[PDB]
């Protein structure tokens, strides 16, 4: 009846805890979705409540593939287009990357995780168009997974938005998602641009997605995302031997009385493989690591590596390129 694979479940548990202990972190979560059905194959939380469904976080940089997809789907951006990625101001506040480049093409924006570049891609759409796009991805939306305490997330209405909000949401702040809503949204990337329902039951009928982007655009985005796990990309720690992996890192500062603090982070890592035609999505978040680094790449990449590499094995998926080990 249940779609949870005990072997992936066990693997996800062990590796989650090994990372949480190692990094002296408060809490953490792993979800593993079927990339074409939305079946949950694994879902684990450090002890306590089912954080995967009940808790909402700001996605940060693991949001960025979505505005990017939107740009490309519209016809207004091509994958080769170059953008000005310098710091710029919207009223008082300033939008910037942690490493400054003067320009990046779209592929640069993904591989390096450019806040500015993502917000330049966002800025070509009306508030309504971005809202509608995030809503269609399930941001702020009940999933009816069948779990109790299901968080809807938060998606403030576009009629209310200050201009800075459009921009900050495009690179992941001022909006909130359960890790499970976030994994789900990635089915748009994996299921040829159709958002899938999520369920913990084996399903007897093909599930029907809602079309959000073209099949051609998901394909292009998945290829862009391979850059994240190769040299020059922020998720190199996440690479799995034998396979190209489309992934996205995200490190977020936390909100304490509504101001962002520089001594408290949430590390996230979501990816799928094989990149060209994925079978699986793996999502990791770890909250408030205190030892042995705080970046997505070093905190959540290794966890992802082991859960993805062990899932592909367990499901009888063969390596698509030769090992270098
Ligand atoms: C370190 C990174 C490469 S920057 C980028 C990105 C997305 O996650 N993270 C940020 O832009 C994030 N900013 C952030 O939290 N806030 C909150 C409100 N405004 C704002 O920008 C940050 C975290 C740590 C140091 C510097 C910046 N991805 C990181 C990755 O891959 O771990």
PDB file of C-alpha atoms in Angstrom, residues 45-234:
ATOM      1  CA  UNK A  45      13.081  14.072  10.014  1.00  0.00           C
ATOM      2  CA  UNK A  46      15.343  14.340  13.013  1.00  0.00           C
ATOM      3  CA  UNK A  47      13.160  13.310  16.053  1.00  0.00           C
ATOM      4  CA  UNK A  48      10.160  15.535  16.744  1.00  0.00           C
ATOM      5  CA  UNK A  49       7.330  16.629  14.449  1.00  0.00           C
ATOM      6  CA  UNK A  50       7.123  15.841  10.706  1.00  0.00           C
ATOM      7  CA  UNK A  51       9.032  19.037   9.703  1.00  0.00           C
ATOM      8  CA  UNK A  52       9.014  18.052   6.011  1.00  0.00           C
ATOM      9  CA  UNK A  53       5.278  18.827   5.841  1.00  0.00           C
ATOM     10  CA  UNK A  54       4.645  20.971   8.950  1.00  0.00           C
ATOM     11  CA  UNK A  55       7.503  23.477   8.722  1.00  0.00           C
ATOM     12  CA  UNK A  56       7.954  26.205   6.141  1.00  0.00           C
ATOM     13  CA  UNK A  57      11.276  27.827   5.318  1.00  0.00           C
ATOM     14  CA  UNK A  58      12.366  30.501   2.866  1.00  0.00           C
ATOM     15  CA  UNK A  59      13.687  28.556  -0.154  1.00  0.00           C
ATOM     16  CA  UNK A  60      16.546  30.943  -0.920  1.00  0.00           C
ATOM     17  CA  UNK A  61      18.565  29.933  -3.946  1.00  0.00           C
ATOM     18  CA  UNK A  62      16.808  26.585  -4.601  1.00  0.00           C
ATOM     19  CA  UNK A  63      13.948  28.794  -5.917  1.00  0.00           C
ATOM     20  CA  UNK A  64      16.029  30.337  -8.728  1.00  0.00           C
ATOM     21  CA  UNK A  65      15.533  27.549 -11.341  1.00  0.00           C
ATOM     22  CA  UNK A  66      11.861  28.636 -11.465  1.00  0.00           C
ATOM     23  CA  UNK A  67      12.123  32.353 -12.566  1.00  0.00           C
ATOM     24  CA  UNK A  68      14.804  31.096 -14.936  1.00  0.00           C
ATOM     25  CA  UNK A  69      12.372  28.517 -16.397  1.00  0.00           C
ATOM     26  CA  UNK A  70       9.728  31.249 -16.614  1.00  0.00           C
ATOM     27  CA  UNK A  71      12.002  33.586 -18.584  1.00  0.00           C
ATOM     28  CA  UNK A  72      12.935  30.829 -21.045  1.00  0.00           C
ATOM     29  CA  UNK A  73       9.359  29.498 -21.408  1.00  0.00           C
ATOM     30  CA  UNK A  74       8.046  32.982 -22.357  1.00  0.00           C
ATOM     31  CA  UNK A  75      10.339  33.313 -25.396  1.00  0.00           C
ATOM     32  CA  UNK A  76      11.860  36.514 -23.951  1.00  0.00           C
ATOM     33  CA  UNK A  77      15.130  34.996 -22.756  1.00  0.00           C
ATOM     34  CA  UNK A  78      17.511  32.609 -24.496  1.00  0.00           C
ATOM     35  CA  UNK A  79      19.955  30.377 -22.565  1.00  0.00           C
ATOM     36  CA  UNK A  80      22.934  32.321 -24.035  1.00  0.00           C
ATOM     37  CA  UNK A  81      21.717  35.843 -23.112  1.00  0.00           C
ATOM     38  CA  UNK A  82      23.998  37.907 -20.879  1.00  0.00           C
ATOM     39  CA  UNK A  83      22.870  40.149 -18.021  1.00  0.00           C
ATOM     40  CA  UNK A  84      24.349  42.917 -15.922  1.00  0.00           C
ATOM     41  CA  UNK A  85      24.932  41.335 -12.483  1.00  0.00           C
ATOM     42  CA  UNK A  86      26.373  44.326 -10.577  1.00  0.00           C
ATOM     43  CA  UNK A  87      24.799  45.399  -7.250  1.00  0.00           C
ATOM     44  CA  UNK A  88      21.852  47.747  -7.816  1.00  0.00           C
ATOM     45  CA  UNK A  89      19.316  49.471  -5.588  1.00  0.00           C
ATOM     46  CA  UNK A  90      15.529  49.321  -5.395  1.00  0.00           C
ATOM     47  CA  UNK A  91      14.606  52.359  -3.321  1.00  0.00           C
ATOM     48  CA  UNK A  92      16.800  52.113  -0.149  1.00  0.00           C
ATOM     49  CA  UNK A  93      17.721  48.391  -0.235  1.00  0.00           C
ATOM     50  CA  UNK A  94      20.402  46.738  -2.375  1.00  0.00           C
ATOM     51  CA  UNK A  95      20.401  43.455  -4.335  1.00  0.00           C
ATOM     52  CA  UNK A  96      23.764  41.673  -4.727  1.00  0.00           C
ATOM     53  CA  UNK A  97      25.625  38.362  -5.031  1.00  0.00           C
ATOM     54  CA  UNK A  98      28.295  37.151  -2.554  1.00  0.00           C
ATOM     55  CA  UNK A  99      30.812  37.026  -5.421  1.00  0.00           C
ATOM     56  CA  UNK A 100      30.521  39.962  -7.841  1.00  0.00           C
ATOM     57  CA  UNK A 101      30.566  39.451 -11.597  1.00  0.00           C
ATOM     58  CA  UNK A 102      29.703  42.339 -14.000  1.00  0.00           C
ATOM     59  CA  UNK A 103      27.837  40.013 -16.334  1.00  0.00           C
ATOM     60  CA  UNK A 104      26.754  36.363 -16.376  1.00  0.00           C
ATOM     61  CA  UNK A 105      24.848  34.508 -19.085  1.00  0.00           C
ATOM     62  CA  UNK A 106      21.884  32.440 -17.890  1.00  0.00           C
ATOM     63  CA  UNK A 107      24.160  29.443 -17.360  1.00  0.00           C
ATOM     64  CA  UNK A 108      26.505  31.542 -15.190  1.00  0.00           C
ATOM     65  CA  UNK A 109      23.491  32.717 -13.143  1.00  0.00           C
ATOM     66  CA  UNK A 110      22.550  29.093 -12.319  1.00  0.00           C
ATOM     67  CA  UNK A 111      26.056  27.715 -11.772  1.00  0.00           C
ATOM     68  CA  UNK A 112      27.166  30.579  -9.465  1.00  0.00           C
ATOM     69  CA  UNK A 113      23.731  31.341  -7.954  1.00  0.00           C
ATOM     70  CA  UNK A 114      23.406  35.046  -8.802  1.00  0.00           C
ATOM     71  CA  UNK A 115      20.688  36.849  -6.823  1.00  0.00           C
ATOM     72  CA  UNK A 116      21.052  39.881  -9.116  1.00  0.00           C
ATOM     73  CA  UNK A 117      20.848  37.839 -12.317  1.00  0.00           C
ATOM     74  CA  UNK A 118      17.768  35.961 -11.173  1.00  0.00           C
ATOM     75  CA  UNK A 119      16.081  39.236 -10.216  1.00  0.00           C
ATOM     76  CA  UNK A 120      16.929  40.714 -13.642  1.00  0.00           C
ATOM     77  CA  UNK A 121      15.096  37.723 -15.214  1.00  0.00           C
ATOM     78  CA  UNK A 122      12.177  38.204 -12.795  1.00  0.00           C
ATOM     79  CA  UNK A 123      11.961  41.936 -13.583  1.00  0.00           C
ATOM     80  CA  UNK A 124      10.678  41.337 -17.131  1.00  0.00           C
ATOM     81  CA  UNK A 125       7.291  40.159 -15.755  1.00  0.00           C
ATOM     82  CA  UNK A 126       4.384  41.840 -14.019  1.00  0.00           C
ATOM     83  CA  UNK A 127       3.765  41.096 -10.307  1.00  0.00           C
ATOM     84  CA  UNK A 128       0.663  39.179 -11.391  1.00  0.00           C
ATOM     85  CA  UNK A 129       2.615  36.980 -13.811  1.00  0.00           C
ATOM     86  CA  UNK A 130       5.211  36.051 -11.150  1.00  0.00           C
ATOM     87  CA  UNK A 131       2.516  35.434  -8.504  1.00  0.00           C
ATOM     88  CA  UNK A 132       0.477  33.273 -10.900  1.00  0.00           C
ATOM     89  CA  UNK A 133       3.661  31.353 -11.727  1.00  0.00           C
ATOM     90  CA  UNK A 134       4.589  30.691  -8.084  1.00  0.00           C
ATOM     91  CA  UNK A 135       0.972  29.736  -7.268  1.00  0.00           C
ATOM     92  CA  UNK A 136       0.875  27.302 -10.202  1.00  0.00           C
ATOM     93  CA  UNK A 137       4.056  25.790  -8.675  1.00  0.00           C
ATOM     94  CA  UNK A 138       2.068  25.221  -5.457  1.00  0.00           C
ATOM     95  CA  UNK A 139       3.656  27.993  -3.353  1.00  0.00           C
ATOM     96  CA  UNK A 140       1.025  28.942  -0.771  1.00  0.00           C
ATOM     97  CA  UNK A 141      -1.074  25.977  -1.880  1.00  0.00           C
ATOM     98  CA  UNK A 142      -2.396  22.977   0.049  1.00  0.00           C
ATOM     99  CA  UNK A 143      -1.183  19.682  -1.495  1.00  0.00           C
ATOM    100  CA  UNK A 144      -3.564  17.239   0.282  1.00  0.00           C
ATOM    101  CA  UNK A 145      -0.732  14.708   0.529  1.00  0.00           C
ATOM    102  CA  UNK A 146      -2.761  12.966   3.234  1.00  0.00           C
ATOM    103  CA  UNK A 147      -0.408  14.073   6.055  1.00  0.00           C
ATOM    104  CA  UNK A 148      -1.799  16.045   9.056  1.00  0.00           C
ATOM    105  CA  UNK A 149      -0.283  19.448   9.937  1.00  0.00           C
ATOM    106  CA  UNK A 150       0.297  20.153   6.219  1.00  0.00           C
ATOM    107  CA  UNK A 151       1.729  23.648   5.741  1.00  0.00           C
ATOM    108  CA  UNK A 152       0.346  25.633   2.795  1.00  0.00           C
ATOM    109  CA  UNK A 153       3.373  27.923   2.781  1.00  0.00           C
ATOM    110  CA  UNK A 154       3.012  31.702   2.396  1.00  0.00           C
ATOM    111  CA  UNK A 155       2.549  33.666  -0.816  1.00  0.00           C
ATOM    112  CA  UNK A 156       1.563  37.288  -0.147  1.00  0.00           C
ATOM    113  CA  UNK A 157      -0.803  38.610  -2.804  1.00  0.00           C
ATOM    114  CA  UNK A 158       0.724  40.559  -5.735  1.00  0.00           C
ATOM    115  CA  UNK A 159      -1.615  43.528  -5.125  1.00  0.00           C
ATOM    116  CA  UNK A 160       0.264  44.038  -1.842  1.00  0.00           C
ATOM    117  CA  UNK A 161       3.870  43.812  -3.148  1.00  0.00           C
ATOM    118  CA  UNK A 162       6.436  46.587  -2.670  1.00  0.00           C
ATOM    119  CA  UNK A 163       8.804  46.505  -5.755  1.00  0.00           C
ATOM    120  CA  UNK A 164      11.713  44.949  -3.784  1.00  0.00           C
ATOM    121  CA  UNK A 165       9.502  41.936  -2.947  1.00  0.00           C
ATOM    122  CA  UNK A 166       9.168  40.805  -6.581  1.00  0.00           C
ATOM    123  CA  UNK A 167      12.951  40.793  -6.794  1.00  0.00           C
ATOM    124  CA  UNK A 168      13.710  39.130  -3.435  1.00  0.00           C
ATOM    125  CA  UNK A 169      11.126  36.403  -4.016  1.00  0.00           C
ATOM    126  CA  UNK A 170      12.828  35.573  -7.314  1.00  0.00           C
ATOM    127  CA  UNK A 171      15.920  34.470  -5.360  1.00  0.00           C
ATOM    128  CA  UNK A 172      13.942  32.945  -2.544  1.00  0.00           C
ATOM    129  CA  UNK A 173      12.999  35.427   0.250  1.00  0.00           C
ATOM    130  CA  UNK A 174       9.642  36.835   1.376  1.00  0.00           C
ATOM    131  CA  UNK A 175       7.875  33.555   0.551  1.00  0.00           C
ATOM    132  CA  UNK A 176       7.675  30.173   2.340  1.00  0.00           C
ATOM    133  CA  UNK A 177       7.515  26.462   1.450  1.00  0.00           C
ATOM    134  CA  UNK A 178       7.571  23.109   3.205  1.00  0.00           C
ATOM    135  CA  UNK A 179      10.497  20.993   2.002  1.00  0.00           C
ATOM    136  CA  UNK A 180       7.791  18.729   0.524  1.00  0.00           C
ATOM    137  CA  UNK A 181       6.158  21.603  -1.458  1.00  0.00           C
ATOM    138  CA  UNK A 182       9.684  22.443  -2.681  1.00  0.00           C
ATOM    139  CA  UNK A 183      10.441  18.884  -3.805  1.00  0.00           C
ATOM    140  CA  UNK A 184       7.001  18.721  -5.424  1.00  0.00           C
ATOM    141  CA  UNK A 185       7.572  21.939  -7.412  1.00  0.00           C
ATOM    142  CA  UNK A 186      10.699  20.353  -8.949  1.00  0.00           C
ATOM    143  CA  UNK A 187       8.410  17.797 -10.718  1.00  0.00           C
ATOM    144  CA  UNK A 188       7.770  20.626 -13.163  1.00  0.00           C
ATOM    145  CA  UNK A 189      11.471  20.269 -14.026  1.00  0.00           C
ATOM    146  CA  UNK A 190      11.436  16.449 -13.962  1.00  0.00           C
ATOM    147  CA  UNK A 191       7.946  15.653 -15.390  1.00  0.00           C
ATOM    148  CA  UNK A 192       8.236  17.590 -18.671  1.00  0.00           C
ATOM    149  CA  UNK A 193       6.841  20.815 -17.174  1.00  0.00           C
ATOM    150  CA  UNK A 194       3.788  19.353 -15.399  1.00  0.00           C
ATOM    151  CA  UNK A 195       3.396  19.765 -11.647  1.00  0.00           C
ATOM    152  CA  UNK A 196       2.574  16.375 -10.089  1.00  0.00           C
ATOM    153  CA  UNK A 197       0.456  15.588  -6.973  1.00  0.00           C
ATOM    154  CA  UNK A 198       2.298  13.962  -4.077  1.00  0.00           C
ATOM    155  CA  UNK A 199       1.106  10.876  -2.237  1.00  0.00           C
ATOM    156  CA  UNK A 200       2.471   8.216   0.112  1.00  0.00           C
ATOM    157  CA  UNK A 201       0.305   5.461  -1.380  1.00  0.00           C
ATOM    158  CA  UNK A 202       1.302   3.284  -4.324  1.00  0.00           C
ATOM    159  CA  UNK A 203      -0.926   4.602  -7.109  1.00  0.00           C
ATOM    160  CA  UNK A 204      -3.058   2.519  -9.445  1.00  0.00           C
ATOM    161  CA  UNK A 205      -3.704   5.168 -12.118  1.00  0.00           C
ATOM    162  CA  UNK A 206      -1.320   7.585 -13.868  1.00  0.00           C
ATOM    163  CA  UNK A 207      -1.503  10.935 -11.958  1.00  0.00           C
ATOM    164  CA  UNK A 208      -2.397  14.032 -13.926  1.00  0.00           C
ATOM    165  CA  UNK A 209      -0.122  17.047 -13.755  1.00  0.00           C
ATOM    166  CA  UNK A 210      -1.031  20.640 -14.549  1.00  0.00           C
ATOM    167  CA  UNK A 211       1.058  22.128 -17.390  1.00  0.00           C
ATOM    168  CA  UNK A 212       3.248  25.001 -16.163  1.00  0.00           C
ATOM    169  CA  UNK A 213       6.088  25.117 -18.708  1.00  0.00           C
ATOM    170  CA  UNK A 214       6.827  23.417 -22.035  1.00  0.00           C
ATOM    171  CA  UNK A 215       8.524  20.024 -22.171  1.00  0.00           C
ATOM    172  CA  UNK A 216      11.321  21.712 -24.188  1.00  0.00           C
ATOM    173  CA  UNK A 217      11.932  24.270 -21.416  1.00  0.00           C
ATOM    174  CA  UNK A 218      12.179  21.743 -18.568  1.00  0.00           C
ATOM    175  CA  UNK A 219      14.696  19.855 -20.728  1.00  0.00           C
ATOM    176  CA  UNK A 220      16.795  23.023 -21.168  1.00  0.00           C
ATOM    177  CA  UNK A 221      16.607  23.909 -17.454  1.00  0.00           C
ATOM    178  CA  UNK A 222      17.666  20.392 -16.387  1.00  0.00           C
ATOM    179  CA  UNK A 223      20.743  20.741 -18.643  1.00  0.00           C
ATOM    180  CA  UNK A 224      21.587  24.166 -17.180  1.00  0.00           C
ATOM    181  CA  UNK A 225      21.359  22.625 -13.741  1.00  0.00           C
ATOM    182  CA  UNK A 226      24.065  20.047 -14.518  1.00  0.00           C
ATOM    183  CA  UNK A 227      26.532  22.997 -14.255  1.00  0.00           C
ATOM    184  CA  UNK A 228      25.744  23.233 -10.524  1.00  0.00           C
ATOM    185  CA  UNK A 229      27.369  19.810  -9.881  1.00  0.00           C
ATOM    186  CA  UNK A 230      30.480  20.244 -12.102  1.00  0.00           C
ATOM    187  CA  UNK A 231      33.650  22.339 -11.612  1.00  0.00           C
ATOM    188  CA  UNK A 232      32.844  26.056 -11.284  1.00  0.00           C
ATOM    189  CA  UNK A 233      29.402  25.215  -9.803  1.00  0.00           C
ATOM    190  CA  UNK A 234      28.332  25.682  -6.169  1.00  0.00           C
TER     191      UNK A 234
END
